[PDB]
Design a binder for this molecule. Structure first.
Ligand SMILES: NC(=O)c1ccc[n+]([C@@H]2O[C@H](COP(=O)([O-])OP(=O)(O)OC[C@H]3O[C@@H](n4cnc5c(N)ncnc54)[C@H](OP(=O)(O)O)[C@@H]3O)[C@@H](O)[C@H]2O)c1
Ligand SMILES: NC(=O)c1ccc[n+]([C@@H]2O[C@H](COP(=O)([O-])OP(=O)(O)OC[C@H]3O[C@@H](n4cnc5c(N)ncnc54)[C@H](OP(=O)(O)O)[C@@H]3O)[C@@H](O)[C@H]2O)c1
Ligand SMILES: [Zn+2]
Ligand SMILES: [Zn+2]
Lengths: 357, 357
């Protein structure tokens, strides 16, 4: 079968040929339909974040997949089920408490693999296998955009933990601010629009000049676009308002610290970005004091698990159809796969189509 | 009646004479028994934190009080009830949502007074009044050390919010690290010893040379004393272990940032300290990345309300008697009140006794 991989010490993604996998007991064989590309694939291509599987000359890319079950083997899935795989798998050494208690999304560094990211091959191949417990059935009509279920689930987890931090009191937020206008930030902005907490005012931070299709999406969602070149995060409360909820999806360390100054009293910031080490001068006193005197919280979140994937299928149904059309800027057949990795300002979310139906 | 106050633009606390207050409808008249002194009284004496009531030449100090109801007026309290007052009261402008929904502890700056701290006179007077809804009945046998109920309640709130942040997954902590060996840190260390989460290893940070009575308390509680001069917070995981729970009670901004590096995966830091502005170089990248990749949380907490005072009465009963004897280094009659404000390394918690029975 054909797969898209990065080979050791090489620049670009290439097609390689590999044997079709055979499922072991408890695994289904899945025929890949579409696989999404995000920053991590780019990040993994260049070098930073992730790592190749031991003893292998390459890494099959892709962690956002949808496929059709072609051989259910000895599992309780049915031939033709549309499934989305979770990303985390047990490490080489074997199972651990995080997997045994069904919360692999909470496993620390070195106690998990992430398919297509660290230690294990991804899903950009014509077929793959997985244990039934890590394959989530989704409605058949979500198959075409099913690679979006994984990123939606990332936000479903982050919101769950962020909201739990505010559960000891009566919190009624009215404003939310998403930092970043990438595919995660934009998806999140749309989710916040339909969130049960009933946000009235939405804001999204970016740094683009008009005309720009990400600005258009933000404003078409009835949110306010904030240019960070004109209004840094710290200054937002003066120009606009204090924000009850902040969701950080920029990967810019200054935002993690500065968001505390933009939070309303009793607010919470969710941090999703993954930056490199970067040292600079901060007023730690102001950070510390705001957190305490105004009962604020910061919560970090990574990955997601089955329950968040399931929740994502419901959220998906609530998202406007125009939004999904504008977010996915290209789906490319395997024959033209290189186009899926071209990044420019007009490219938002791409995917590669391996097969149909 | 006699009161202990700081007069405008003066150095020291002094005795003033004031008329006995009369309770309005819904208020009881309370005869003060004992009032504790903490950092905030010292901080309020010198100048920083707090503010005098409008149009007044002085501030009656003290926010940690226990008293006996002498006139229940038209309330449902009974003559001779032992009560502890809460600290927050509505501001000059009048009530607001935080008070109406019974969560004044969540009110932002300018939407509350704090008796003995900002905008309203404290409890270091022979008598005071309060609304029945802000007077918490406690067991009669807790009257002698009843000024401890307020600081215990501070921790009851912080633990509630910190623990709520971890409620979306199965968290089973085994290690806890208290930063600071002041009266709040030491009380908190004792509370963690009897906490239902079942901590196995306890640690407390300070910077004292032996012999020192705070080191003795820490070690007598079977905790490990960590000298920050030898082992900074960031280095603790190498020398000892990663900490599931950190409670910050130093007021030192570096600790708010560095505690993220000492947290175990999935851990939470509670921040209680109130520092001044202070700017310095931090690796914000390392802070940001640890928070995200290891699903960590930081939660700030200030003040407390009725339910936390009630919980404190149960916690009090579980604290070892030796600990309470060693923590309270002096109770001073009104005649020798100045001694209650002397601070040195051998002084831990003091109180002033206004009356008995
Ligand atoms: N925690 C998790 O499980 C998880 C999952 C997915 C992604 N992530 C992380 O989340 C972040 C976002 O992911 P993504 O797929 O949306 O990535 P992305 O495509 O790179 O989006 C990041 C966006 O942030 C904007 N940005 C960066 N710095 C900015 C600044 N200073 N002011 C305003 N905008 C700024 C960028 O704008 P420009 O293009 O104009 O530079 C870009 O559009 C990344 O750090 C990624 O690693 C974490
Ligand atoms: N959030 C709230 O509702 C609330 C309530 C009460 C108190 N607080 C705050 O909580 C903090 C503690 O209160 P407290 O009554 O216990 O105050 P405290 O009596 O001043 O205790 C602070 C302790 O921290 C130690 N400390 C300071 N810097 C240190 C460092 N770098 N390394 C090791 N130890 C250090 C001090 O040691 P040394 O004596 O050796 O200098 C002191 O013993 C204060 O900031 C106070 O404002 C907040
Ligand atoms: Zn993804
Ligand atoms: Zn106090």
């Amino acid at each position: 079968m054909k797969a898209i991989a990065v080979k050791r010490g090489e620049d670009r993604p290439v097609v390689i040929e590999k044997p079709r996998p055979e499922p072991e007991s408890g695994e289904a064989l899945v025929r890949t339909l579409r696989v999404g590309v995000d920053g991590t694939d780019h990040e993994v291509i260049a070098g930073g974040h992730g790592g190749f599987p031991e003893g292998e000359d390459h890494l099959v890319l892709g962690h956002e997949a949808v496929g059709v079950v072609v051989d259910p083997n000895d599992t309780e899935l049915e031939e033709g089920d549309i499934v989305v795989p979770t990303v985390r798998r047990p490490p080489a050494s074997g199972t651990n408490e995080y997997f045994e208690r069904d919360q692999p999304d909470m496993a620390p560094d070195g106690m998990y693999f992430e398919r297509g990211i660290v230690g294990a091959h991804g899903y950009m191949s014509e077929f793959f296998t997985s244990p039934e417990k890590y394959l989530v059935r989704i409605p058949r009509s979500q198959a075409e955009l099913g690679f979006l279920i994984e990123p939606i689930s990332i936000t479903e987890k982050a919101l769950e933990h962020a909201y739990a931090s505010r559960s000891a009191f009566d919190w009624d937020p009215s404003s939310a601010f998403v930092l970043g206008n990438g595919s995660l930030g934009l998806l999140t902005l749309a989710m916040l629009k339909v969130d049960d907490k009933g946000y009235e005012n939405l804001y999204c931070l970016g740094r683009r000049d008009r005309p720009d299709p990400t600005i258009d999406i933000i404003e078409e969602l009835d949110a306010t676009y904030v240019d960070s070149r004109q209004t840094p995060v710290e200054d937002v409360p003066d120009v606009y308002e204090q924000m009850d909820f902040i969701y950080e999806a920029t990967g810019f360390p200054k935002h993690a610290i500065q968001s505390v100054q933009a939070l309303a009293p009793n607010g919470v910031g969710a941090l999703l970005g993954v930056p490199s080490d970067w040292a600079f001068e901060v007023d730690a006193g102001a950070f510390h004091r705001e957190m305490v005197l105004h009962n604020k919280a910061l919560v970090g979140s990574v990955n997601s698990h089955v329950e968040h994937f399931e929740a994502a299928t419901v959220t998906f149904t609530k998202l406007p159809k125009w939004f999904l059309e504008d977010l996915v800027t290209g789906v490319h057949p395997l024959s033209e796969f290189e186009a899926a990795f071209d990044d420019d300002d007009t490219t938002i979310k791409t995917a590669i189509e391996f097969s149909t139906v």
